[model samples]
Target chain A: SEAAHVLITGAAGQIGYILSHWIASGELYGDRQVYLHLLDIPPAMNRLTALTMELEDCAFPHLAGFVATTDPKAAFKDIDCAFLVASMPLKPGQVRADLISSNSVIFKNTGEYLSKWAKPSVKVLVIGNPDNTNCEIAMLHAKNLKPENFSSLSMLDQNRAYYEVASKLGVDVKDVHDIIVWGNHGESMVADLTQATFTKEGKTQKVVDVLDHDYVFDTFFKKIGHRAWDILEHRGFTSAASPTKAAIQHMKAWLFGTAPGEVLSMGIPVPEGNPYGIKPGVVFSFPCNVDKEGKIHVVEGFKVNDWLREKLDFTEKDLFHEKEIALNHLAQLEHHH
Target chain B: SEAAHVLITGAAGQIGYILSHWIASGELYGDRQVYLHLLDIPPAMNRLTALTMELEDCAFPHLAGFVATTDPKAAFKDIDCAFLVASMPLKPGQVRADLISSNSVIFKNTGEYLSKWAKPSVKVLVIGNPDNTNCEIAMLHAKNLKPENFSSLSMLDQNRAYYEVASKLGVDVKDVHDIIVWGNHGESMVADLTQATFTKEGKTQKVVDVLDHDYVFDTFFKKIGHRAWDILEHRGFTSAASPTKAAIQHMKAWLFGTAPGEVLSMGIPVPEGNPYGIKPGVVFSFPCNVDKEGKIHVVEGFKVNDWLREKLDFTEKDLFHEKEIALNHLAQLE
Candidate 1:
């Protein structure tokens, strides 16, 4: 495949810093050439310049060009992959509603610009907070753009929760399959392990059989759900490296295809008229297998017990609330005629 | 040429963290597979593990393998390029002598191990502080090993000083050539700009004409020598990123060959018989160029003015003092 021009929004953010290097250096994917567009607010231009200098010194073979700008239209122009990694950082005791409302404005405006300016085939992966709802707002605003091209990042939460579960059971992460984190990208995320397995002595056993159900629930499900908070509480800073690394992993799979028989999680917009019971225009996490063609398939018919279904419903309700907040914010913005 | 296995010591340091990913990802070099041997103390093992996990996640096609160990012998075993980035972090008000004494132990042990276990054709770039003397300690300890394969990093200091001079004169850095920083990798080091040129309005002028000779003496020759101290005062930390980046650049040039007419500064061991009016067992920085066979040619016959010669003598004396300190320490320990 030819080199792709990747447009990275909030390119000075913690995740964006690592991801930009990964793309420019051809590290995450193979040594493929890339034209990078780093979009940041005006204030972060100096930091971006320093980063650009560092990139030049590294002398990446695949780095065709680097453009750093504050203009959204110029940033998104001719980009093949748009990675939205920026959002207003949340503070201590900040409410989710306020978080959703504030970020909605930014996403809506960016979405409108992207729809008008970006290439027809640009694939976007949103990594900001309130990602699912933000993606929904973006999809609604970008009516001309393909719905399948937009996705929110739930892969980090899924990978973290799955690794926690695997660690407790003393198994490789690859052995744990069919795991999913349903709902918002927050404390309310549902870490489903119904199909999770532990292989020992050449036989595959349910993870619950090896690990106590209560112990697993406390440590893996609940604890992993609050892992980011734990890091923030102790480190007094958000985890930029690990989550950013996960973002790179997620995009690599989406753009280059996943290993055979492997399924990942992504927040994709479901067709409003579809019978999946998901609300139309709502971007939510589902078991997805992605390839170069974008989202190739969303796995269906996973057996969800009443308990799991309740959690999924709760997550969907949160998504609905975020969607309402986003729409109200979009209504107040002055539309560019 | 095929890819080489590069071993970076103190691989979890600030500079190591930045350069590790750059090299492993093939961003700095071409699409060549690299097996990295990351060495650090046992206490820093976790950070190295985390770094290894990141390298795996990056999934670079050229990443042959990654091994992290606390044992120098284990780390140096079968390595091709040993980039010695490990050193003692200098505290406030530290003197040059104290720095030499402290880093001597590390360089001595590492040198012995490199000689004992490293591949026959291993090349070494010492980036540790008191670098030129450390290169000397390594060379003495590795007496049985090939001396030509080892050198110290003066390229970074030279590049920084040259850049300051070029920026001050409003000349492109590319246009400034034949500049050399000779002697110890310290403040006493000489920055020779007699051969440097500045292009203006389709006319090339000597750099000395545009800038006051006194200003050049104080800034490029004296004050710019304290660039590390200046950064340290502002940031409360010494510069490892920029110099480490430069060290990588120098090694890449030496191993892969440089452009025509391009030269660098390095601290190489003097010939065994005092061929250059210098002690046989000392490492000193001079203008050097590398050929296709990776052989370094130290440029000779540059006219050394009386002032430059005086500075070179001062640097040489400091280096000899450091060599004495290191040798005594090694002997006492033995």
Candidate 2:
């Protein structure tokens, strides 16, 4: 009935550049009015200003109002939805600890300012790489916010799993479901196809029966974990449109419920004494469905075989390590101050 | 309720790459499924093949099926809608005739194939540069197709006109309407502001009254013609997103009817005995409204001042010269 103030960080960068149109169209928000708050680093404002001019030129009916700012507080003020797209991009020679050490300050600053300015119930989806740990860093700083309100992007990795399976089996992507990406959004991430299915010859078929375990794990699932590098080898630049589209899908599914019985891959906080043996307080991904009120119910009852469990444990360890590194940086930052 | 089969040539280029997603989203057609046929030069097939793979990965619900091809007939066969986006890239130091001659051969071959293979009522919108003249070339070659079904994009220039006024007045762009671009999609093109209006203080205001005649024409109107280079100077590459968005908006307005009293700028085939004095059969831009059947009627009865008429004449002359160059190339190619 009313317009919600939505903000996107890195708003002058390519993904943010591409994402603005989809949001302004209001299709994801179901033809309702929306106001946009775009944020970028100080250096990106000129480009973001030019982008603002272009957005104004678009004349979208539901684009109620828009502003581009270098100030995080100004950008986050009163925002209902926020996409944490800005980050120190992974560069050559940057180790995992180095990435955490740098982006910890960035995410902590964003989270601190977000807590100070944004709506109390603001929903945040992290899209920057090393995303789950980034989510942990942000959630720790914005400790006042709900855990479910802060999440990371595993939907892109999940869609890759769906694609690889559908491509291997020569079936439509719609036929595939519950191809979950478990734990970290990285090479250590696990694709639990234990509950995935596809259709053939007018009957439903299980993924387990379609391919041998070796072929599924070695060939298909692993391909999804490293798919970004493979695509980068093909394209000189990182992909923008599809991942941005995935963020939109993730937000829609988070705000409005996913379809009845449909499940998705999301990075939510691992609570104390978490099931699935993941570390508490770190952001971990699982096959889950979100309610309208932002509660995550990890869809249960799927059998995790020994091989799958080992694969999942590898990512669980990766999450704990990354979370520890990010916290160390947080402590160092606090001590410095 | 049936899905439309749509085709876009140069389907791997920057604009094509940008447009494919907007098309896949199905918001333009209200969630109706669409089958996509992508055509490009032989060298671009590898890029297109890669693009098709990414499209599959996107898992768009309404993208029923898509194929990327280098064969013109294969791409054109039985399509309900098409965007003529591919063209021969202009070489450095090439003259106007050289530009027309090359693209003439390209579009003629495309039009000939499209005439033989496409459905009887295929709707085509041109996005290739020198587009109005390009539309004329394709239409001349595909004589069997309806003239009204072929058109060119002046919507980009029209939006520029709207942007200039909206910027100058510091009002929302939604308030501006009927700001038209006449004749060619080029330097001499006229941005018609006589019928343009915007809202302020809950009251309607004319664009002409907001700015002086000298400022509107000499400064603002002249800038629309050169804004692409202005953008290229800003971004190292030529701009893609806004023009691609313009193409999508044009297709929506072309396929579905424009609302009553809402006018758009389109390059349609100039009919015999033209009232605004454009030469017959040349694709010329005018303020027009489309119907359900995609018929574009020039919205008439607006007052045209002498200065504005003179500005329109420069583009009219440009179109006539372009038509001649295209017809010359067509005869040589035939």
User: What TM-scores do the predictions have?
Assistant: 0.70, 0.93
RMSD of 2: 2.5
Per-residue lDDT tens digits for candidate 2, residues B196-272, read: 88898998978888788788868886677667776665555666777778888888988888988788888899877
**Evaluated on chain B only, what is the TM-score of candidate 2?**
0.95
Per-residue accuracy of model 2 over A1-337 as CA lDDT, tens digit each = 7788899999988888778877887756776788999998887776786677566556677788888898877899998889999899667998878887789888988888778888888989998878898888888888568786788888887777777787788887778767887888767888788878888778887898878979886777667756776666655567777788789998988888777878888888886655576667678888788787766677777677788789878888888888888888778878999
Candidate 2 off by > 4 Å: A271-279, A293-296, A332-337, B1-3, B272-277, B332-334
Q: Give the range of the ten consecutive residues with the poorest summed lDDT in model 1 chain B.
A: B53-62
Off by over 4 Å in 1: A1-3, A28-31, A91-93, A233-236, A271-277, A332-337, B1-13, B16-86, B90-98, B106-127, B130-334
Write out the backbone clash pairs for model 1. A272-A280
Q: List-wise, what DockQ does each model earn?
A: 0.12, 0.46
lDDT of 1 by residue, B16-122 (tens): 76567667755445776778889988788766766665555343445666778888777988888878888886779987777887888878778889888888788
Best by TM-score: 2
Best by lDDT: 2
* C-alpha positional error of residue B319 in candidate 1 after TM-score superposition, expressed in Å: 6.7
